[PDB]
Amino acid sequence: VVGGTEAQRNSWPSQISLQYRSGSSWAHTCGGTLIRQNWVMTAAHCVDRELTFRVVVGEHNLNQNNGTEQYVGVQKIVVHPYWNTDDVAAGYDIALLRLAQSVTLNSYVQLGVLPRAGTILANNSPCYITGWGLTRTNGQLAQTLQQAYLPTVDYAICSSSSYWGSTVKNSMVCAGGDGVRSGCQGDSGGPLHCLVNGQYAVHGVTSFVSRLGCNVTRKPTVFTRVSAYISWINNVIASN
Ligand SMILES: [Ca+2]
Numbered sequence: 520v521v522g523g524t525e526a527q528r529n530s531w532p533s534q535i536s537l538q539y540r541s542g543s544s545w546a547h548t549c550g551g552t553l554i555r556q557n558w559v560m561t562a563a564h565c566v567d568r569e570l571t572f573r574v575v576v577g578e579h580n581l582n583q584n585n586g587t588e589q590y591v592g593v594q595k596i597v598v599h600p601y602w603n604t605d606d607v608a609a610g611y612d613i614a615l616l617r618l619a620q621s622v623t624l625n626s627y628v629q630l631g632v633l634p635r636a637g638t639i640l641a642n643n644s645p646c647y648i649t650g651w652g653l654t655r656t657n658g659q660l661a662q663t664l665q666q667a668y669l670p671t672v673d674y675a676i677c678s679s680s681s682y683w684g685s686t687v688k689n690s691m692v693c694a695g696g697d698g699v700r701s702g703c704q705g706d707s708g709g710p711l712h713c714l715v716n717g718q719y720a721v722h723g724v725t726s727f728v729s730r731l732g733c734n735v736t737r738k739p740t741v742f743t744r745v746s747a748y749i750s751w752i753n754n755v756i757a758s759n
Pocket of ligand 1: 579580
């Protein structure tokens with residue numbers, strides 16, 4: 520997250536760190552949202568590579584013991600069937616991970632609340648992106664979980680020529696674009712949390728930013744629109 524501030528430890532208890540085994544250790548690669556005790560919602564693109572993956576819940580600082588972490592292997596990966604790695608702009612950038620064990624819920628580990636199907640936010644709706652992604656374009660991952668205030672940019676604006684044009688689809692949510700604050704590499708798969716009727720809900724799964732850079736004016740961060748996938752999510756969980 521570029522232009523973020525450090526999240527308080529218990530602000531976003533559904534945020535998870537998706538990690539892969541790298542030698543004797545593990546490397547953070549993507550965010551995710553805990554949606555059942557044994558299911559995580561992430562981006563399809565985060566799991567294109569044939570890697571060994573684990574999920575960390577109750578994580579705050581990637582580089583030190585928080586005393587709150589639980590570590591769980593990924594048992595099964597279900598990518599949306601229409602996802603195409605050669606075409607992120609087509610959408611469908613969403614995947615569900617079934618965990619090998621059910622995690623224990625507490626102040627640091629909670630299920631993310633999802634919006635009702637079909638919900639579209641009015642332009643400029645207040646949201647926060649969270650993640651351990653790069654803190655600058657071509658920079659380094661954060662150590663501590665970061666948050667950035669990123670108001671939505673509706674489909675009509677976001678898909679206009681000076682923004683993202685045809686690249687953005689109605690199955691996506693755009694947020695930010697101020698040239699200062701944005702998602703960045705390593706935030707992919709994580710939540711966009713938006714405040715509606717007094718409650719934060721996870722309206723987005725972080726999907727992409729501009730090839731030109733993370734915080735680029737009029738290139739808001741783009742998210743898979745969770746409310747477009749409610750039936751698909753339920754169908755997968757019910758059949759697995
Ligand atoms: Ca830690």
